[PDB]
Design a protein around this ligand. Structure first.
Ligand SMILES: [Y+3]
Ligand SMILES: [Y+3]
Ligand SMILES: [Y+3]
Length: 117
């Protein structure tokens, strides 16, 4: 199914070599701002995150007070929430540390969602 399954940590740790190290989290952010976006700006809003997040949560995620994220910030809010999704430790995350168990935080910056099957 491709586009619909380019969709989690499970698109950048299908390997479970051990974890996502930051290079694979970076690859999850770049994948996610692509498949999130139907107005075609990668600048990420109350109808991009349609049913994903409240318009109040939408203005949590961003740093520079747009009220919304960017192709810069679905690539940087991910990395700012990277260490925090792990309860411990330094610079690595297994799916147990991410995929809506223990890291259900950082999910909001890399899970996106699509419009289809
Ligand atoms: Y890996
Ligand atoms: Y948009
Ligand atoms: Y912004």
């Amino acid at each position: 199914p491709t586009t619909t399954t380019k969709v989690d940590i499970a698109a950048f740790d299908p390997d479970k070599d051990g974890t996502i190290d930051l290079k694979e989290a970076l690859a999850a952010g770049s994948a996610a701002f692509d498949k999130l976006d139907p107005d075609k700006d990668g600048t990420l809003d109350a109808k991009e995150l349609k049913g994903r997040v409240s318009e109040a949560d939408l203005k949590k995620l961003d740093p520079d007070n747009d009220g919304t994220l960017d192709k810069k910030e679905y690539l940087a809010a991910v990395e700012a929430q990277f260490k925090a999704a792990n309860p411990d430790n330094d610079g690595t995350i297994d799916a147990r540390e991410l995929a809506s168990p223990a890291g259900s935080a950082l999910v909001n910056l890399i899970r996106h969602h699509h419009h289809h099957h």
